Structures are given as C-alpha cells and as structure tokens.
C-alpha cells in the first residue's frame, strides 16, 4: 500500500482504495475453446441488464459492444472507479464476457479540502503505481510509497535518509473541524468577490502548528479538476507585497529603539521621496496627530517617519531579524524566500508599509508569533510525524522551535496594545473585523499588486490585495488567523471597504467556539 495521510485527530485525508473496472469480451474466439460462452452472446439484453448500474444508456452500451471485432472493450471514465457493491450487483447477473478487474485508486474523502497542501498523486496507467505530483504527496512520496524502499529521501529537506511492503503514514497538524470553517468561508468570498488569488491560514499562536489552510483557485485532488493551473502553494511558495500587515514589524522595530512614543505627535499628509508624493491612504492626511492614532488609522507617513528616526541600515537588519527575505525552513518543497526591497530610498520607504518587499504568508505568521510569545518567533510547521504504522517507527516528528527572538517582552506587549487599538479604538478604521462575544485584534493590510510579468502595479478601480493578520482572544490568544485576497473581480468596492472581514469573522468565531473559548454578550 501507499501510506495514509492523517490529520492531528487521526482522521484520514488520503488513502488507497480498491475499485473496479468493467471489461467486456465481444469476440466469439473466447467461446470457441469450451461450452459456456465467454463473450457477449446477447449484446441487446446484456446491455439492458448493465443499464442498471452507472452510465446506463442501453443503446450506447450496444454501440460499444458492437465496435469492430476487437477482443476486449472498456467504457471510458464511466468504466472505472466502480465500487465493490456495484461489482457484487453485476456479478449476480453472471453475464457472458463481462468481468470487473480490481484497480487501486487514491481516495481523498473530503474531495476539495486543503487541496494545495495535501497535494495529489497521479497513477501510471500501465503499472497502477501512484506518484505524488504536488504537496505532501510529492514531498513524502518515497516514504508513502511502500514499494520504493531503496534509498528514501525527503525531497528537499536534506536528511532523514532511512533506507510484501506497506507504506509510511504522514500525520499533519491540520484539524479537519477547523479546515471545514476555512473551506466554507473561502467558498463564500469566491462567490462574492471572484478574486484572482485568496488564502486563509489558522495557526496555533503558542506552537506554530498549522490548524487549517486553503487557497483559491485550488483544485480537487480526487478528480484532478483544475490541477496544474495554479501549481504554487500560496502559504509557502507564492510571494506577496503584503501591505499594511507589514507595518506591525516597522512598529516593533521603532518601539524597541525607543523612537516610537504613542502620545508623540507627528506630521501626517504627504512625503516627497525621489520625486514622488508618497502619501497616506486618504491622500490628504489628518495633520499633526499622535503616532498611536496614525497606526490605528494605518498611516503610511508614520512608518516613513519612524524609518528616518531609527535609521536605514538598522531597519534593514530589523526586517531580517523578523525572518523576512529568508526561508522559514518549513517542511515544504521549494519554499520561497521573498526579498527585502532596499535598493534605494524609494524601495526602503515603500517597504515600511509593505510594498517592494515580498513575503511568504508563512514568513508573516512567523513574525507575528513574536508578539504573543514574549518576542520569540515560532517556526511554523504542518507535519506532525511520518511513521510506519506496523513498526511505529518515527522517521520524523515535528515540534515547536524558536526561529529567533528579535524583540523584547516589553516591546511585544506594547505592540499588542496598538494591535488591540487598530480594531477596538473609538476612531478604528477596522470595526468591520469585530466579533460578538470575543475580543479581536490585528492589522488591516491593503496593498497594490505588481503586474505579473514586468511593468509597475496593476491599475483599475480597486486593484488591491487586502489582508488581515488577526489573533484572539486578545492579549493571550489561542490562534492567529491570516486571510489575504488579491484583485477582487466583483464588488471590488466592498472589497476595499470591508476587506477579508467577511471571511475572518466566521472562521475566527467558529474556531473559538469549537475550541471552547469563553464568551460575554449577545
């Protein structure tokens, strides 16, 4: 067998199953050698009797039974993936020339479910051998594959090279219950907005475990629908100009260097950099205001100010210590490193509010974790264990690791206080993200998206990648939820206004409810 892929609760996400294939011998030669006929003798009534199961047009079955004088015939995709109780039903008809041959298929019980993480294994027609083409299935192919026991190698994750055979089972950190909430809410967003790109990830604030992840446009692993259009996994392989979500780190840097004072007033409005009026989202500003406010509002000028006070060279190092521009050394294939945009003053400035600079969504989880774990960034991981279920031998076992402490405990508490404000302030420009009964906090994340191949940015009515990096319960969270949407093709206006609030709210509410986190008032 190819090994199974389980969730954290032990529920199967992928497994091998035995299905069957219909074959009909149509040539008299078969029955020339003995008494009882071994070819279809009454095409007409055989076709009717078979019109009981599956793609039952009796005449279309007769067309196929009537074809040339080939020995044996198949029935396309309908003539495959037949269940065992379908087999039994036909076997009782005892028809001349009809047979079902066993074939193994990879089965994903949920169909479209974390499609881009789980991945998909393709079948070699001739041999019946399954081989991972994307996601888990590809990374862990050798271990999964009960056959390939020559020299087993973990794709790109250099090491663990442990050299009638059953395969190895892969245990993920995913919780099927939380994954449901994600898939449902993303379906909603696609219906509403029809974005070009979309993701949501739920991470355990205190471990770095990925509890749920999906993206649109994804594929259906079961059917092979849409597989190969978008190959890239958003979370690990695709880069984004993150936008205002990225200010959180620009702030932390400052707070620590002692350059940010929440009550100190700064000049908002415009900032002339390299012959360009880089201005706030409102284009006009709010004049002289406290920094605390600027951040609540998401002032682009604030971050630019703060960069100047701290210093270019020092801010670059700050973003590096927050794990950006480098792989998170997660368990996934060809994880994208992104890059800190720092070639000139323009790139540097635009970076502090999340342009020029590219990140993996994961880099961002890693960063954000700092604020709730006393300045320690947690390595985000999704693989709980790879173990042969016969021997119980663990070839890998995942655990929570500290990918760095860039910031202090004091700094983290002060950052959290501002994140609380961003949502729960009197003048909050992010009330849309508030939930009933539960205390939320996080950062709005509106960004311009780059032209796919060459040119500048995408233009249009609202050509924005909106995001929210939220956590709850406030101060001492259970989870981080990061949703991002790129280029809504429908209701682009509401998209800019609400952002991903319409997806974050349900996911977080449902998750907290399922994890039995206490409420207040309805």
């Amino acid at each position: 067998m190819r090994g199974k892929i389980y969730d954290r609760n032990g529920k199967v996400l992928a497994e091998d199953v035995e299905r069957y294939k219909l074959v009909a011998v149509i040539d008299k030669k078969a029955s020339a050698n003995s008494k009882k006929p071994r070819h279809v003798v009454d095409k007409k009534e055989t076709a009717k009797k078979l019109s009981t199961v599956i793609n039952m047009k009796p005449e279309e079955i007769e067309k196929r039974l009537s074809q040339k004088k080939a020995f044996q015939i198949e029935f396309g995709r309908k003539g495959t993936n037949l269940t065992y109780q379908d087999k039994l039903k036909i076997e009782k008809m005892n028809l001349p020339g009809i047979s079902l041959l066993p074939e193994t298929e990879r089965f994903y019980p949920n169909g479209n479910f974390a499609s881009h993480l789980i991945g998909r294994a393709q079948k070699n027609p001739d041999t019946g051998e399954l081989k991972g083409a994307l996601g888990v299935e590809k990374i862990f192919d050798s271990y999964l594959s009960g056959s390939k026991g020559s020299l087993r190698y973990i794709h790109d994750i250099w090491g663990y090279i442990a050299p009638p055979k059953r395969g190895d089972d892969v245990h993920l950190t995913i919780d099927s219950n939380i994954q449901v909430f994600v898939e449902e809410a993303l379906d909603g967003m696609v219906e509403r907005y029809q974005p070009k790109d979309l993701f949501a990830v739920v991470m355990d604030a205190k471990t770095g475990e990925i509890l749920a992840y999906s993206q649109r446009p994804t594929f259906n692993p079961e059917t092979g629908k849409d597989f190969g259009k978008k190959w890239a996994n958003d979370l690990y392989q695709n880069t984004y100009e993150p936008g205002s979500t990225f200010k959180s780190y620009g702030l932390a840097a400052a707070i620590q260097e002692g350059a940010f004072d929440p009550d100190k007033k700064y000049k908002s409005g415009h900032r002339d950099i390299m012959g360009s009026r880089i201005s706030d989202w409102n284009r006009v500003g709010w004049g002289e205001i406290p920094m605390s406010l600027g951040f609540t509002y998401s002032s682009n000028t604030l971050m630019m100010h703060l960069q100047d006070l701290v210093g270019a060279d020092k801010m670059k190092s700050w973003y590096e210590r927050f794990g950006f521009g480098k792989s998170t050394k997660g368990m996934f294939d060809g994880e994208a490193p992104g890059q800190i945009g720092w070639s000139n003053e323009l790139q540097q400035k635009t970076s502090s509010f999340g342009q020029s600079t590219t990140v993996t969504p994961v880099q961002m989880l890693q960063a954000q974790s700092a604020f709730f774990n006393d300045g320690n960034m947690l390595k985000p991981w999704f693989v709980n264990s790879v173990e042969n279920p016969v021997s119980k031998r663990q070839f890998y076992k995942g655990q929570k690791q500290i990918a760095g402490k860039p910031i202090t405990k004091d700094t983290a508490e002060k950052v959290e206080k501002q994140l609380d404000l961003v949502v729960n302030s009197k003048k909050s420009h992010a009330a849309n993200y508030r939930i009933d009964g539960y205390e939320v906090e996080g950062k709005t994340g509106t960004a311009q998206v780059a032209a796919p191949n060459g040119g500048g940015y995408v233009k249009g009515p609202n050509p924005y990648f909106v995001s929210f990096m939220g956590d709850a319960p406030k101060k001492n969270p259970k989870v981080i939820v990061y949703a991002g949407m790129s280029l809504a093709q429908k209701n682009d206006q509401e998209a800019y206004e609400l952002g991903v609030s319409k997806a974050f709210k349900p996911i977080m509410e449902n998750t907290l409810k399922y994890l039995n986190v206490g409420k207040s008032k309805d």
């Binding site: 936008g243 989202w281 998401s298 709005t444 800019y496 206004e497």
Partner: peptide, 5 residues
C-alpha cells in the same frame, strides 16, 4: 489603503 469606511 489601510481603512476605507
């Protein structure tokens, strides 16, 4: 962006 509301 950042707000818008």
């Amino acid at each position: 962006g950042g707000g818008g509301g």
